[PDB]
Amino acid sequence: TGLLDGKRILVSGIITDSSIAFHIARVAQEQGAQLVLTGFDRLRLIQRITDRLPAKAPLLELDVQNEEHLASLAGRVTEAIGAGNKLDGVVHSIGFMPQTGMGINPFFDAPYADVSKGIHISAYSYASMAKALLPIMNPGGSIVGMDFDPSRAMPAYNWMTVAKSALESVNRFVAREAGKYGVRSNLVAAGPIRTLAMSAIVGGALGEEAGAQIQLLEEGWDQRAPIGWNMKDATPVAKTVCALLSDWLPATTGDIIYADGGAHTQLL
Amino acid sequence: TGLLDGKRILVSGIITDSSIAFHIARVAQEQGAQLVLTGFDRLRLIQRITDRLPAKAPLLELDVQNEEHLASLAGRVTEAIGAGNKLDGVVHSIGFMPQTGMGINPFFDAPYADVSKGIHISAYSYASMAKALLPIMNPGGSIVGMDFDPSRAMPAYNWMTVAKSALESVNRFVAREAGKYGVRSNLVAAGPIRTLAMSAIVGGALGEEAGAQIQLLEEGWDQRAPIGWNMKDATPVAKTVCALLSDWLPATTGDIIYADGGAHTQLL
Amino acid sequence: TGLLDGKRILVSGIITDSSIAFHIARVAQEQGAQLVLTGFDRLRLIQRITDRLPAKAPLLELDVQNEEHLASLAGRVTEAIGAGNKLDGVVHSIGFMPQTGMGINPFFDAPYADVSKGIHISAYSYASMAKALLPIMNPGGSIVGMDFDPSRAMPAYNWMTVAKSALESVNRFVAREAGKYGVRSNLVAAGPIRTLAMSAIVGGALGEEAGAQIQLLEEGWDQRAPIGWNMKDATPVAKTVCALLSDWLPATTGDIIYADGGAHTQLL
Amino acid sequence: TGLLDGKRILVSGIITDSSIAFHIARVAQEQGAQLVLTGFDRLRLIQRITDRLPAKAPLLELDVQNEEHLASLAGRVTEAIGAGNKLDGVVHSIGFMPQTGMGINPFFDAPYADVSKGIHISAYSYASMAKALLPIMNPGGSIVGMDFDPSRAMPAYNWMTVAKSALESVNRFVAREAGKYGVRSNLVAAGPIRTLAMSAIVGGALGEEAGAQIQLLEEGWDQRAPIGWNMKDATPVAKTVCALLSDWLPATTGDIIYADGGAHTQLL
Numbered sequence A, B, C, D: 001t002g003l004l005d006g007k008r009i010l011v012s013g014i015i016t017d018s019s020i021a022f023h024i025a026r027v028a029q030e031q032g033a034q035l036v037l038t039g040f041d042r043l044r045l046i047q048r049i050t051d052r053l054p055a056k057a058p059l060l061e062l063d064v065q066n067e068e069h070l071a072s073l074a075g076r077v078t079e080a081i082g083a084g085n086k087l088d089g090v091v092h093s094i095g096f097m098p099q100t101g102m103g104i105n106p107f108f109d110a111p112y113a114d115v116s117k118g119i120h121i122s123a124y125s126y127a128s129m130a131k132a133l134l135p136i137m138n139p140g141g142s143i144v145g146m147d148f149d150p151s152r153a154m155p156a157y158n159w160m161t162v163a164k165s166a167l168e169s170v171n172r173f174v175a176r177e178a179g180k181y182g183v184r185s186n187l188v189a190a191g192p193i194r195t196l197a198m199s200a201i202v203g204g205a206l207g208e209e210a211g212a213q214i215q216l217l218e219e220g221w222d223q224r225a226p227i228g229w230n231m232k233d234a235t236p237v238a239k240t241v242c243a244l245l246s247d248w249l250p251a252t253t254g255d256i257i258y259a260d261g262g263a264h265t266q267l268l
């Protein structure tokens, strides 16, 4: 009697045990979902990481920049879940921007080739994944992507913020197409989560000023959030994604749900 | 094993079996919640209407314009649910604007006394209810109010739209206060629902032009919604309110969840 | 050859030489406009203050809570500017909220009578003034009101923020009506300006915590503004109002122009 | 005694006499500005078109996808305007999306190579142009780009809407950098203008359904605009750009000014 009992849900984006997607997968399994996982490049690592999930799930390779992987994906998923079965949910938890597009590297000095790669992986791939999987999704189904509110500019995040603005726009178009299948498409805009990469950045991996700026941003988030914000805890974010995967938000699509402690609603 | 098993939830705003609050109450009871109901003025009618709910619930009188009713409310609720018990949820489903403030009556011709009454009931009362009930709410609790997206002006709705803009602002402040109790505050912005009053209005009760305009607005909503919009079905709205009353959106506050078919995300 | 050469413009809201309206009036006169001024209650004071403007202008009494003043206003203006002449612009620079609705007085402790008075003066009066003056405005004309961005909640400002949310909604409806006369309606959302009252508040007139909070807010504004923000200088705000009064934004109505240093576009 | 007397302004994006940039250039010259023009690929055509402007202006080649053109641009401009002189304004009026990214070609069927080209030209180039020209701009200067409101999805516009969402984000970051030079950066979001390409599209060049949809969108715009919207008249848009190029919006940056008849403020 979990929130997601009987649902078949694909979860992308696990790379470490600090991945937001790891916690989405854990909570969904706790709530009765049957998962198919996708992973990029380091499949041995990902298998070993996902061995710590509450239940065993098949792992498929998916590089979203690889047209063959995308073209074969629906077939591979159907093989994993069995002929005649379809997916009820899809989680996009994929993002990347080359180091030239973040941190103390000046905003104007990011070459377009690097920005384009970041936008490919972080924004266009949400459309790619919906194209590939909508044909094997059930009516009432749900596609959910991860967002970081890009409505105002911020230090350090630079072109990744631009990629998120593009992702929000992409989501509104995906909703039009997904609606033809009876499927919802939405984003969860999370507050900052202290993943391995975010910890490295705060430690100065992309420069001291950038680290200092991101640290101030994290502190400001908890102070603005009327219920507080714990950047070391992905569970509230994972729960929100599961809410959208469930049957309990059936009239919400093309939209953005903020799992940020309410920080975006307060100026200070 | 309902979504709201064991929760104690107060539900305001039932007047007929077409009330959005009637459906919120029905769905919450289906999901295991224990309700306390509040009603305005016609308590005999409300008792008879609420006899059709899945479970019996106590009904308390609450006129939100009555300072004594508000001052006694927490005590009366505690009497109904038992000393030592607190509420886990509160639903504000209260709205009103005098006829001078809606329809074909020109926008400029609404006297301020009428507008002020509408704003009192529709916006300020969300703060009044939170003031009264926060002292008897548990941490992890949830306050939810009903909204109709007022970001753009519309024909006929006139000062009621202004009242909703004020309610959205009020909600952001209520969240600051509610956060001190570990409690969330949010609004559900619904698409149009064909209540008795909305049917009367479309039938011309506030003028022919106003009726025609609201009818065009309803038609436009279903056409813009990527998953469609059924104005005769309050269930998707009721489910969304229950989602916010549950433990599954624990990092969302001061915010607005759109149960509108995704219509607000599309231009056509 | 000023920006506003030949235009006849009514300017409300002067009370001291720190009033934003004083600077709007000064800049408009510098740019060739012919003014009619309106003042509330302290007409001797206002006359003496406005004697420091670059040119003499008639001063009319207008209490926006007084229905007789509003009913006679168009006639009195026509008397001042001459039969057969109409206004090309109208400036609403009027705001008030009783002390119970701002500062350290708890948000929940403002009586509705006080909030209603604040909303009457700060929001409803924008509609009242447009109703009174549209019949004596020329096509191509412009109505401009003063706003403080209320999209997110803030400390201390409390019910005044709610009143601004209502004013933004009112402006969108006023634009519908004003469009029938060929007239635009817009708001300028200014950053904080150190008027006499704002200085008193920062000095603690509405409590120490409230003062401290507003001071932090002012400091944050200059730090977020990509071009900086000088709270002691109303001239950039006055220039923006004049821009909207001119012929150079002829396709903008129901809208909000931000004269805030760009602060609202940045998170830090 | 024009609005822009004495200002030196670079204007990109003229290709035909229906180009929005043609009208921006004409109005700026009418208001006393000294122009430098940039053109892409068809320089003979552009020279002949710009011969119809009120005053002669030098024309420089600029393909924004060409790193050499961008690297030499400041030098070439300085040659055109004279050593020791700087620019006071810069107009970005550049946009493109391959046909696979617009019209009846399904949203999911646009190859990323095509989308990336569109985003390069339509969004990233706003940053490229600011990088190139900020070093030769005066304090008090102004950078302005053209936008089409992408907050909600629309039929047919597809990936061009995504590119505009990215441009809005890019503008907020450009404002941070431009502020260091005392320079403002803003976008004008215009309603639909019947350029040669828009006429071709409505005539079905990208499919019948797409044409029909864009035609309905244009009609809806005029009906929602409280002051109306004339898609055959670029002058109100050109005036708005000139407003931002002038000294009269000195506290607005990272922002978007809507020259759309107020259509975005109304639902119907």
Ligand SMILES: NC(=O)c1ccc[n+]([C@@H]2O[C@H](COP(=O)([O-])OP(=O)(O)OC[C@H]3O[C@@H](n4cnc5c(N)ncnc54)[C@H](O)[C@@H]3O)[C@@H](O)[C@H]2O)c1
Pocket: A012, A013, A014, A015, A016, A018, A019, A020, A021, A039, A040, A062, A063, A064, A065, A092, A093, A094, A095, A096, A121, A146, A147, A148, A189, A190, A191, A192, A193, A194, A195, A197, A198
């Ligand atoms: N960490 C934060 O503060 C935060 C805040 C809000 C949103 N998000 C978003 O949540 C999502 C998950 O990121 P995370 O913070 O958990 O970091 P992460 O590094 O754990 O997850 C990012 C994932 O993207 C995958 N990826 C990269 N390139 C790929 C490709 N070509 N094909 C397929 N997958 C690829 C990586 O393998 C990795 O699994 C991202 O969209 C991120 O922007 C993160």
Ligand SMILES: NC(=O)c1ccc[n+]([C@@H]2O[C@H](COP(=O)([O-])OP(=O)(O)OC[C@H]3O[C@@H](n4cnc5c(N)ncnc54)[C@H](O)[C@@H]3O)[C@@H](O)[C@H]2O)c1
Pocket: B012, B013, B014, B015, B016, B018, B019, B020, B021, B039, B040, B062, B063, B064, B065, B092, B093, B094, B095, B096, B121, B146, B147, B148, B189, B190, B191, B192, B193, B194, B195, B197, B198
């Ligand atoms: N019907 C719609 O299309 C629609 C769309 C979005 C949101 N809403 C909102 O949903 C909420 C419920 O409205 P509804 O459409 O179900 O209509 P309804 O008439 O069924 O409910 C309105 C309720 O407000 C109560 N009320 C009025 N004055 C009161 C007072 N002084 N004290 C206490 N209660 C009082 C009424 O008794 C009634 O129960 C309202 O906030 C409304 O604005 C309605």
Ligand SMILES: NC(=O)c1ccc[n+]([C@@H]2O[C@H](COP(=O)([O-])OP(=O)(O)OC[C@H]3O[C@@H](n4cnc5c(N)ncnc54)[C@H](O)[C@@H]3O)[C@@H](O)[C@H]2O)c1
Pocket: C012, C013, C014, C015, C016, C018, C019, C020, C021, C039, C040, C062, C063, C064, C065, C092, C093, C094, C095, C096, C121, C146, C147, C148, C189, C190, C191, C192, C193, C194, C195, C197, C198
């Ligand atoms: N000072 C700020 O930081 C700031 C920031 C953004 C916007 N604003 C707004 O600018 C406008 C002007 O305010 P200000 O800061 O210059 O303060 P102010 O006190 O100088 O101006 C407020 C004016 O409102 C007038 N007023 C009050 N009650 C009235 C009534 N019943 N009838 C007619 N007029 C009445 C007062 O007489 C006074 O002239 C207000 O709308 C205010 O909210 C102020």
Ligand SMILES: NC(=O)c1ccc[n+]([C@@H]2O[C@H](COP(=O)([O-])OP(=O)(O)OC[C@H]3O[C@@H](n4cnc5c(N)ncnc54)[C@H](O)[C@@H]3O)[C@@H](O)[C@H]2O)c1
Pocket: D012, D013, D014, D015, D016, D018, D019, D020, D021, D039, D040, D062, D063, D064, D065, D092, D093, D094, D095, D096, D121, D146, D147, D148, D189, D190, D191, D192, D193, D194, D195, D197, D198
């Ligand atoms: N026409 C509309 O309805 C409308 C509405 C809002 C905004 N806009 C925007 O206004 C701007 C001007 O477009 P327009 O409608 O006047 O069409 P247009 O075709 O007249 O102008 C587009 C210009 O972009 C230039 N361009 C394309 N690729 C280039 C490159 N690689 N390098 C340099 N320049 C290049 C073209 O040469 C052309 O001059 C665009 O940003 C457009 O998106 C148009």
Ligand SMILES: Cc1cc(C)nc(SCC(=O)/N=c2/[nH]cc(Cc3cccc(C(F)(F)F)c3)s2)n1
Pocket: A094, A095, A096, A097, A098, A099, A148, A160, A196, A197, A198, A200, A201, A205, A206
């Ligand atoms: C909002 C947000 C924030 C973050 C940190 N990641 C994400 S998506 C995951 C992502 O982009 N991961 C990256 N890993 C590495 C990137 C670039 C980089 C280059 C060199 C060094 C680092 C370092 F040290 F790991 F931070 C990072 S970007 N989204």
Ligand SMILES: Cc1cc(C)nc(SCC(=O)/N=c2/[nH]cc(Cc3cccc(C(F)(F)F)c3)s2)n1
Pocket: B094, B095, B096, B097, B098, B099, B148, B160, B196, B197, B198, B200, B201, B205, B206
């Ligand atoms: C967004 C929205 C829309 C509606 C119709 N009601 C609500 S809240 C409920 C509400 O305001 N109820 C009203 N009942 C009566 C009102 C004014 C009125 C006056 C005369 C006649 C009518 C009529 F006929 F019932 F429509 C209505 S307003 N909110």
Ligand SMILES: Cc1cc(C)nc(SCC(=O)/N=c2/[nH]cc(Cc3cccc(C(F)(F)F)c3)s2)n1
Pocket: C094, C095, C096, C097, C098, C099, C148, C160, C196, C197, C198, C200, C201, C205, C206
């Ligand atoms: C955004 C914003 C901010 C401010 C300060 N005023 C405005 S409109 C002008 C306004 O409301 N003036 C007021 N004057 C007095 C008010 C309440 C008050 C009560 C007691 C003492 C004060 C004090 F000391 F002058 F600040 C103020 S509110 N708008």
Ligand SMILES: Cc1cc(C)nc(SCC(=O)/N=c2/[nH]cc(Cc3cccc(C(F)(F)F)c3)s2)n1
Pocket: D094, D095, D096, D097, D098, D099, D148, D160, D196, D197, D198, D200, D201, D205, D206
């Ligand atoms: C918002 C908006 C709307 C439009 C029509 N253009 C712009 S920027 C100018 C632009 O993108 N021009 C284009 N010219 C051609 C494009 C693709 C296309 C391909 C084949 C045929 C056409 C046709 F027929 F000229 F419309 C167009 S896209 N921005």
Ligand SMILES: [Mg+2]
Pocket: A051, A052, A053
């Ligand atoms: Mg294990």
Ligand SMILES: [Mg+2]
Pocket: B051, B052, B053
């Ligand atoms: Mg019964």
Ligand SMILES: [Mg+2]
Pocket: C051, C052, C053
């Ligand atoms: Mg004098």
Ligand SMILES: [Mg+2]
Pocket: D051, D052, D053
């Ligand atoms: Mg010639």
